Amino acid sequence: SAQEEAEAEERRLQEQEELENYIEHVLLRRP
């Protein structure tokens, strides 16, 4: 159980963009 960890942390980047884009999409669309 070492590789799985590498992914568990990767989420930190996924969630970041997941939220950063969630606003950019709604904003850019409805400025």
At 21, list the tokens: 């884009």
Max Cα distance, the chain (Å): 46
Host domain of residue 15: 1-31
Phi first, then psi: give them for residue 2, nearest 5 degrees: -125, -40
3-class SS of residue 27: helix
The CA distance from 5 to 7, in Å, is 5
Experimental method: NMR
The CA distance from 5 to 23, in Å, is 29
The CA distance from 10 to 16, in Å, is 10
Give me the number of domains the chain comprises.
1
Q: Please provide the DSSP assignment of 4-25 as one string.
A: HHHHHHHHHHHHHHHHHHHHHH
